[PDB]
Design a protein around this ligand. Sequence first.
Ligand SMILES: [Mn+2]
Ligand SMILES: [Mn+2]
Lengths: 199, 199
Amino acid sequence: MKHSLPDLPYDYGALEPHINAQIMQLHHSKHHAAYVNNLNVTEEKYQEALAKGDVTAQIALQPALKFNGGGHINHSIFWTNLSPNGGGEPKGELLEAIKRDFGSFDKFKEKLTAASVGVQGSGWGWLGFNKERGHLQIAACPNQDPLQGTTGLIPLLGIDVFEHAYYLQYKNVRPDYLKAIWNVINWENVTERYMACKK
Amino acid sequence: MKHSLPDLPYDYGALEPHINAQIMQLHHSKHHAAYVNNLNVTEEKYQEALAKGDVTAQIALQPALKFNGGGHINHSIFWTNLSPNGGGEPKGELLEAIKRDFGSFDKFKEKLTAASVGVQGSGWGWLGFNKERGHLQIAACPNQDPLQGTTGLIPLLGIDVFEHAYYLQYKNVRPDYLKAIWNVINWENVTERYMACKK
Ligand SMILES: [Mn+2]
Ligand SMILES: [Mn+2]
């Protein structure tokens, strides 16, 4: 059992005009494919170092593991966080939590947008669920650093603000990308991750 | 596998008055012991995570692996870098390399002292060997981050400037600790590590 690049659950052009087909095809078939492959390479090196007790080699592999492992985690969620059937607002308990914790849906959007635009360099913005605190929480992550691995928060919605996620279409204007992406958020999927946290 | 705490090459008081017996006993039997015990626990969690393909857990474990793994790496070297028979200046090729790259033994001491005193918070000062350039190099690392694992340099001489390495004796006056430790440097051991990675 090794990790595999999951197929996109929709056509490359399904998110147009918000994210064009060239970005989606490169993002999935080039960037994510590389993370999975590099992740499997790093895991194998880590297994040999562990069997040998080479702690130096284990630590030397950590950046590659976090970057490519994080890449696999984050992009697997990202594809499910988007959909041609997306957009609009969530319903039910997720919507109520958003209003309770952030005041309103629109207030939440400004905060997550500000966190995503506020990333200097490469990184991710996340809406997560804090199991210990029992409420929602917004965080930004550097590079491919994944939310749960580095913060314990359970990822609900991630926004890739790597330049490869938008540059071909929006060039330097990251805020235009952020404006458009709200129209394709698959709140059905985001609701599923939230409801799975509560029991 | 199972890493183990290496026996000290001398008794806890052999480095007095420069490093007192209480520090040595605590440093080896408590601090280093904890790195080994915590390293083994973290490594076991890694094997399970690798067997399960739980990348989040692997990444969540990285800080504990680097801190305790690095702790194990650094302190195992540190003990061999010190000796009751130590002090003075090195001889032969090691001494020649120091004069060439740092001007003189005394200038080398000033630079490594400054790098060690300059660490803000916890960390280590290292004299290392750069295999690609074929010469000596001084660098500082934060916390237990090990020299080779994070820089590729081969460790020759390390100076622990964690507060537990001197505080009981020297309190806040780290420069007195740095000055004193030169008296017990095991240049025979430093030469062995250097010659192993040098003609
Ligand atoms: Mn990406
Ligand atoms: Mn120490």
